[PDB]
Amino acid sequence: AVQKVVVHPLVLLSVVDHFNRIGKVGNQKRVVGVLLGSWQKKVLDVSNSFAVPFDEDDKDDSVWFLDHDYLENMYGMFKKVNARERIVGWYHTGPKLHKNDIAINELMKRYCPNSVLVIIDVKPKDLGLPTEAYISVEEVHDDGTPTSKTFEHVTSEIGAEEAEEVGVEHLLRDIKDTTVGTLSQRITNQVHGLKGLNSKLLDIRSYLEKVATGKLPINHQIIYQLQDVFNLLPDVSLQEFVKAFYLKTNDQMVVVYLASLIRSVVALHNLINNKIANRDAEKKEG
């Protein structure tokens, strides 16, 4: 198991390039490539990637071609350029997995047994996290259900090593937000959080509707986990907490009040100092 697949900025900026390379002329769906990177305790580091000629057909959803020699030869070159990278998985920008993913993943299992596919939604630019990392597991589904290939999910997180970090920071250099936050940006951080929590809760509702209307299979698992989240709610109405909330809300207001007063006396002092300044210069003009 891979606890995390940290996708470095360079990969998602080559995939974007890879999507543009083709889609610009050969209008096509997902662009497939290989993902190189160094291993860690359990967190797979994605540090680079390259494209692999990939052609598919909407018919039979298994007439594809992921070149072997191009994949083999490319990596033959890259291990020369840098030797800390081993093939570790593949990437496709088609937002929704295909029926061809399992079979192709079996191929990339021929180059790295613990192969993780990272879906980069190059086209969308939205709430965030444009990478979704998947593994391959074949289990008996403990709870008495057919076996199958399936793609298990692995937590994805986007990070940066020092070198790319310097390039990225300059690369934006026109839309970066101040790190301090300030009251303006902190609040926007919350209207943003509220929008997400609603958005995540709405994806949950649609699925629950789907299972409710039958259109989807009752997982029987992860379904009650959502029931776990439904019991972990706070129940604020409790009196003993209601008292304890006013105390801390009151504990803070007396600091914003002291903060407010200091900013006021300073304000008046600054007007009195200024009223003297222009007045004194007023008389001194004569």
Partner 1 sequence: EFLHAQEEVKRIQSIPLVIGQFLEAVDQNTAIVGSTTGSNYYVRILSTIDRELLKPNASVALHKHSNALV
Partner 2 sequence: LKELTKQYEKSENDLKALQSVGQIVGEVLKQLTEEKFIVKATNGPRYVVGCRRQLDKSKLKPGTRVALDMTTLTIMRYLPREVDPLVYNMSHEDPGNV
Partner 3 sequence: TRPANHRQLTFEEIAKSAKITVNEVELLVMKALSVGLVKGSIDEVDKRVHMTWVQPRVLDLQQIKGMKDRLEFWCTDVKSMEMLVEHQAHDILT
Residues engaged in binding partner 3 (CB under 8 A): 183-185, 187-188, 190-191, 194-195, 197-198, 201-202, 204-205, 208-209, 211-212, 214, 218, 220, 223-228, 230-231, 233, 235, 237
Q: Which is nearer to partner 1, 178 or 273 (CB)?
A: 178
Q: Residue 77 is encoded by which pair of tokens?
A: 């070159």
Residue pair 97/151 in contact (Cβ under 8 Å)? The answer is yes
162 binds, among partner 2, partner 3, partner 1, none (CB under 5 to 8 A by kind): partner 2
83 binds, among partner 1, partner 2, partner 3, none (CB under 5 to 8 A by kind): partner 2
Q: Hey, is 272 helix, strand or coil?
A: helix
Residue 166's Cβ-side half-sphere holds a number of Cα atoms within 13 Å equal to: 2
User: Which residue pairs, CB below 8 angstroms and at least 24 apart, start in 14-18?
Assistant: 14/48, 14/49, 14/50, 15/49, 15/91, 15/93, 15/120, 15/122, 16/120, 16/122, 18/49, 18/51, 18/93
CB of 263 to partner 3, least distance (A): 17
* Burial class of residue 272, CB neighbours in 10 A (0-12, 13-18, 19+): exposed
Phi then psi for 179, rounded to 5 degrees? -65, -25
Residue pair 151/136 in contact (Cβ under 8 Å)? The answer is yes
CB of 176 to partner 1, least distance (A): 8
Q: Which is nearer to partner 2, 31 or 36 (CB)?
A: 36
Residue pair 105/97 in contact (Cβ under 8 Å)? The answer is no
CB of 129 to partner 1, least distance (A): 25
201 binds, among partner 1, partner 3, partner 2, none (CB under 5 to 8 A by kind): partner 3
CB of 9 to partner 1, least distance (A): 19
171 binds, among partner 3, partner 2, partner 1, none (CB under 5 to 8 A by kind): none
CB of 178 to partner 1, least distance (A): 4
Binding site for partner 2 (CB under 8 A): 79, 82-84, 162
Q: Residue 71 is encoded by which pair of tokens?
A: 């994949």
CB of 207 to partner 3, least distance (A): 9
Q: Residue 75 is encoded by which pair of tokens?
A: 């990596």
179 binds, among partner 1, partner 3, partner 2, none (CB under 5 to 8 A by kind): partner 1
